[PDB]
Amino acid sequence: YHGDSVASLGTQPDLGSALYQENYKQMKALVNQLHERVEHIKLGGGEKARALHISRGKLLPRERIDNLIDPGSPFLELSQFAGYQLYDNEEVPGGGIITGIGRVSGVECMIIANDATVKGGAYYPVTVKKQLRAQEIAMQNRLPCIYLVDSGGAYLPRQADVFPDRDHFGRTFYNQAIMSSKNIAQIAVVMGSCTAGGAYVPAMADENIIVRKQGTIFLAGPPLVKAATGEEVSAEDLGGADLHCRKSGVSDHWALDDHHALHLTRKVVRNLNYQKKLDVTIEPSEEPLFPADELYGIVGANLKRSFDVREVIARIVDGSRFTEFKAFYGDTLVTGFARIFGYPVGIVGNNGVLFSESAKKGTHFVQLCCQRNIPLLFLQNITGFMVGREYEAEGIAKDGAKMVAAVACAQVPKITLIIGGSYGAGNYGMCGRAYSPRFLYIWPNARISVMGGEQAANVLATITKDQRAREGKQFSSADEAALKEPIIKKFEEEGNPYYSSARVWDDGIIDPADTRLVLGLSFSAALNAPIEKTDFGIFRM
Amino acid sequence: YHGDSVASLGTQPDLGSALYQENYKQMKALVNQLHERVEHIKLGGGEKARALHISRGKLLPRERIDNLIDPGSPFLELSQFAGYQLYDNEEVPGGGIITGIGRVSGVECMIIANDATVKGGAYYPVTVKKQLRAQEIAMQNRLPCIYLVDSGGAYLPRQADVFPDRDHFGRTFYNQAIMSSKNIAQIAVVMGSCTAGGAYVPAMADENIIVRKQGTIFLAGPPLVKAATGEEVSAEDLGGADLHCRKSGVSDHWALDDHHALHLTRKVVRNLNYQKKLDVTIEPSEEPLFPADELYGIVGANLKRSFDVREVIARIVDGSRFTEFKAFYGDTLVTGFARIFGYPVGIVGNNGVLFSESAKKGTHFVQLCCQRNIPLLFLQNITGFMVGREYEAEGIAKDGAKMVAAVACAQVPKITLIIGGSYGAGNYGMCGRAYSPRFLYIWPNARISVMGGEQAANVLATITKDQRAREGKQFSSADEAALKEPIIKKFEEEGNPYYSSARVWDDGIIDPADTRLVLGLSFSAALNAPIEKTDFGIFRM
Amino acid sequence: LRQYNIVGLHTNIDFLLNLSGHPEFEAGNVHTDFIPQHHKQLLLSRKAAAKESLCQAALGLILKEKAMTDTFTLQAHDQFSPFSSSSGRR
Numbered sequence A, B: 001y002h003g004d005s006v007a008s009l010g011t012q013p014d015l016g017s018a019l020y021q022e023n024y025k026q027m028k029a030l031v032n033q034l035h036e037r038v039e040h041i042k043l044g045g046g047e048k049a050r051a052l053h054i055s056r057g058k059l060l061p062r063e064r065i066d067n068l069i070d071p072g073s074p075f076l077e078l079s080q081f082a083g084y085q086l087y088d089n090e091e092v093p094g095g096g097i098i099t100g101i102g103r104v105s106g107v108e109c110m111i112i113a114n115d116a117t118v119k120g121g122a123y124y125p126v127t128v129k130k131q132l133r134a135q136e137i138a139m140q141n142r143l144p145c146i147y148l149v150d151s152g153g154a155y156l157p158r159q160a161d162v163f164p165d166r167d168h169f170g171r172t173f174y175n176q177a178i179m180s181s182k183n184i185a186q187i188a189v190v191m192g193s194c195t196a197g198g199a200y201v202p203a204m205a206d207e208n209i210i211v212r213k214q215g216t217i218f219l220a221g222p223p224l225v226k227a228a229t230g231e232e233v234s235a236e237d238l239g240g241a242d243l244h245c246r247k248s249g250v251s252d253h254w255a256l257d258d259h260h261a262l263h264l265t266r267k268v269v270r271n272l273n274y275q276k277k278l279d280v281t282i283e284p285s286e287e288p289l290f291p292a293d294e295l296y297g298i299v300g301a302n303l304k305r306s307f308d309v310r311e312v313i314a315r316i317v318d319g320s321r322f323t324e325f326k327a328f329y330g331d332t333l334v335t336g337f338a339r340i341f342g343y344p345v346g347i348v349g350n351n352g353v354l355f356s357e358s359a360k361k362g363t364h365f366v367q368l369c370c371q372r373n374i375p376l377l378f379l380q381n382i383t384g385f386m387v388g389r390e391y392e393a394e395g396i397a398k399d400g401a402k403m404v405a406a407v408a409c410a411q412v413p414k415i416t417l418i419i420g421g422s423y424g425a426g427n428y429g430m431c432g433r434a435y436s437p438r439f440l441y442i443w444p445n446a447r448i449s450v451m452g453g454e455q456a457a458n459v460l461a462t463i464t465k466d467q468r469a470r471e472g473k474q475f476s477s478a479d480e481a482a483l484k485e486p487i488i489k490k491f492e493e494e495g496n497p498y499y500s501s502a503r504v505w506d507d508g509i510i511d512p513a514d515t516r517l518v519l520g521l522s523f524s525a526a527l528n529a530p531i532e533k534t535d536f537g538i539f540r541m
Numbered sequence C: 001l002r003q004y005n006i007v008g009l010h011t012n013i014d015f016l017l018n019l020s021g022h023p024e025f026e027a028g029n030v031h032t033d034f035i036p037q038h039h040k041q042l043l044l045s046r047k048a049a050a051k052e053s054l055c056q057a058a059l060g061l062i063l064k065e066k067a068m069t070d071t072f073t074l075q076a077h078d079q080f081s082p083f084s085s086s087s088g089r090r
């Protein structure tokens, strides 16, 4: 029996308020800038490179992805801003690679496609990081991997950041082998020549598809063979789909062109013999009771002002229905149960500074969610973490440690969304990147740093002044300004969402109006893997 | 989304070709001979024996089976040719026992019924072998066993081949107890007097049904009691359903006649409280695109000619849809994925002599199928195994060993069908009897031997000639002929399908036009048990 | 005649429609040998389809794909997954 009437969250905002107008204007400008930058990134490596790529009879990577996934199916692309102004004079759109989650033959799959128009598909360090992140997501969510391989190997001038370390290029093959051992399908489609390194990808894959005269696998390219041994040979005779299928045995399928290769890939995915099974209760979906664009007015772009996270919750959850848990204890934290697209979720969001009571409430709610096997959603809007003599006497740090340990030991799917600031150990306490959430998205108005710029400047100035006083040396005000201003500027630059997304510190910047949808998709992709039991450490009471 | 158009196998044969006419004629003659022999076997032990059996008010075993299974349900009888000309002057139709798989109360069950018209139901060695094979099939596929017991115990003149060994009569009780311990139901219906040995079958069964004045259980019959102790007593007082139900407690149900016993058996099977669960993906069934009788023209009866196994595959799979794997590497082997009655299957068939590349491809495909938990179907048409100095230098034997180990270690259901020759270690490499397939059927044109007759004759002649030359003794041509001709004749006789089916080397000879259907049934019976994970040995790279 | 439609078989529906739509038929004067003189007037090649018809055909193809996706979703467990939608959303 599910016929009980239940009160719903949400209030109608004052559309005539000047604050609403200003916030809407600022957020709309931010979203427009984000959309324009995304369009420019989507344009690709360049016009001449695209023309040359088409002249070879090959499809552009985005066309490949569009023709691969099921018709009309939504596609969730990850880290669209990787490499955005990361290198001083080199432009690397999208990191030179395209990673996303799509639906192939009714199965959720992780598609990783090299962009041959960006430096011939060479691997920049950010490209390796993006591919490793995609592989980690596929491993965690138990999703088949499809590699549309068209690469020129590692980028030689940056080799010291690509080859040797643990999280460097070899981890790709390591992850491929490990996921193969766990009955997670690997399919490699060799759409173009792979000079080196990328030749191992089809070799370690479970099944291969190679185009006849485009795809050519060889451990060393003709330039590399000439440089190492001196032997001269053509690319087709060194690789080639005929020469690989007929006697090498590396290739498993033979394709006439890209369209045939994608058709064969869909056939293989159909033959995978996999069926999704859900281990959570499901209820009919229902739209929220308020428009999603109003968030622009509610949130705005200025972080100095504060807003009720219950507005966002009511704008994203199904039917605006929310069951708050411990509403009056630790009011600065909002914890409760809701449903998104029928999936049950436990929402934990910030509404102020984190106190001891808030940390205890968060620990209790995380324990409950882990016990009941319910996915967790975190909403980070952190003004800071409570600090002070009376708080240290009450163990504010120890309560933060309680919350951190509870979040870290959790085994249910965890999804973090940064809607505002994220500073200090509060970021760790609210399931930051270091605590392995299944996904992490930020809004175009977020800010992430160890602390505020002025706080760090004051700390450094006090340290220097005390050290000079102990030494017995004068510390002038001009020295204070020279110490402060560069720190302020650096902290201002490094906190930008685009700065944080150029490096792979998140899975992309999302339009707030799309938030719900994205979450839905993510949670769906999070439910492929079964939920294991949670083992907790020592709860330092 | 399963709306992608997919190319299908199969080509329309030339019905006007003289080769097609000759092949069709030969195969039709073979099938007609098989049908006539099956009819004569079905006739039973003899007219006088049948008249005496009816005069006692009992039903013939085939009538019992027909009245036991669900109405209109198909019945899959196994080893109809056991004992066919196996003994010199004794005729033992069907081995004196009838084993099959049927549907009782909507549950797949293994029915084993003694034929009282053949030597009073005495157990010939082939009867013991057939019953043990049926029990092994039931154990492997987790199927309830129903024993319609009407037997006269072991056949005394052949006791040395029935009583003492491991695979002799005691293994029946061993298997009964073991399958009882694994929650596999055993139901014994005592339809007639059991002199000895057969009296243990109702005792070890989970539930018993005995006819009032027909079924009589006693450890030793009145002749045996007289011979051993000397006590004289009637059969009814020694056994009897009343005397067993009332104070012995051996019997669990009391039946008026055979019809009542079958009704009680159906009630018990209904009360079994079992439900079939499938652990594989299912798709809607679809008929093949070509008639099955055309196989007669395609295959024929002469093994010297060769045919494409893709024709058979297109004639048996659903919708003639086939996804070939590594089509151009190791062309002599055909490996791919298909569906039969909605069940996914991995088909491995022969198209020539086995090479190193073919063995490697087979090993890879077997690994893939084991990883994805897909049943395997083998089609044996073996001209031979490639040998030669250059092949030994490349380890042709080691590649054959790779394939043999991969096939042996597999845990997915395996079904073998011999459509042509089966010689040498290729039989082992293609899941022969020694490698425990769930089922094994042969076509009426197959041939199985260690090698060809002429090859063995040449080998023996060369051995003898070399030994005589080393000894220094002349080896004349008349000696060569006297050594060769008996070997040729013996190899010709022992390779006959009827010779191989008289002994239990397979589960029966099947009409090619029925192949599909039989496979379907078998695969259904193969899916009752859950599929375990596969552990492989050392892959000698 | 417009309401009557055949799919899977070549018919003389177009010939009947051309006969009915020719103004000589509307005039009412029908001759025994009238059709042989106007045989090729009724038998004419198809006209280049307007872009609206092509748009309708493309929409029909898209909607058939959407319906097949809906059927597959019906056969599935996760009935309410956003991936099951045919939004084509990026």
Ligand SMILES: CC(C)=CC(=O)SCCNC(=O)CCNC(=O)[C@H](O)C(C)(C)COP(=O)(O)OP(=O)(O)OC[C@@H]1O[C@H](n2cnc3c(N)ncnc32)[C@@H](O)[C@@H]1OP(=O)(O)O
Pocket: A116, A119, A120, A121, A122, A123, A151, A152, A153, A154, A155, A156, A169, A193, A194, A195, A196, A197, A198, A221, A223, A224
């Ligand atoms: C062990 C492991 C794990 C890995 C390895 O060992 S990795 C070994 C070394 N790699 C190779 O051995 C492949 C060498 N490529 C080639 O054999 C080809 O080139 C192809 C295949 C790439 C197709 O080339 P293409 O058809 O796409 O044209 P191209 O003009 O060539 O494309 C752009 C131009 O590539 C220049 N460029 C700069 N850096 C690289 C780079 N790293 N690889 C390739 N090209 C690069 C770029 O600077 C210029 O353009 P620009 O900057 O001047 O405008």
Ligand SMILES: CC(C)=CC(=O)SCCNC(=O)CCNC(=O)[C@H](O)C(C)(C)COP(=O)(O)OP(=O)(O)OC[C@@H]1O[C@H](n2cnc3c(N)ncnc32)[C@@H](O)[C@@H]1OP(=O)(O)O
Pocket: B116, B119, B120, B121, B122, B123, B151, B152, B153, B154, B155, B156, B169, B193, B194, B195, B196, B197, B198, B221, B223, B224
């Ligand atoms: C420890 C373990 C594990 C096992 C044991 O210890 S096993 C111990 C020994 N078995 C018995 O102690 C049962 C002795 N039978 C009987 O008590 C009865 O006979 C019945 C019950 C069989 C009903 O008999 P029935 O009504 O069917 O008639 P009958 O003519 O008799 O049927 C055909 C005739 O049986 C002759 N015949 C040949 N061999 C046998 C045989 N082995 N058993 C029985 N009959 C046999 C056949 O040669 C002749 O016909 P033929 O060949 O001359 O034409």
Ligand SMILES: O=CCCCC[C@@H]1SC[C@@H]2NC(=O)N[C@@H]21
Pocket: A383, A384, A385, A386, A387, A423, A424, A425, A426, A450, A451, A452, A455
């Ligand atoms: O978060 C920013 C507010 C000012 C700094 C607060 C500090 S950062 C170090 C320590 N860890 C916390 O979580 N808060 C304090």
Ligand SMILES: O=CCCCC[C@@H]1SC[C@@H]2NC(=O)N[C@@H]21
Pocket: B383, B384, B385, B386, B387, B423, B424, B425, B426, B450, B451, B452, B455
């Ligand atoms: O199979 C018959 C062809 C001629 C004999 C081939 C021999 S049998 C011994 C060895 N094992 C094989 O598989 N082939 C060779």
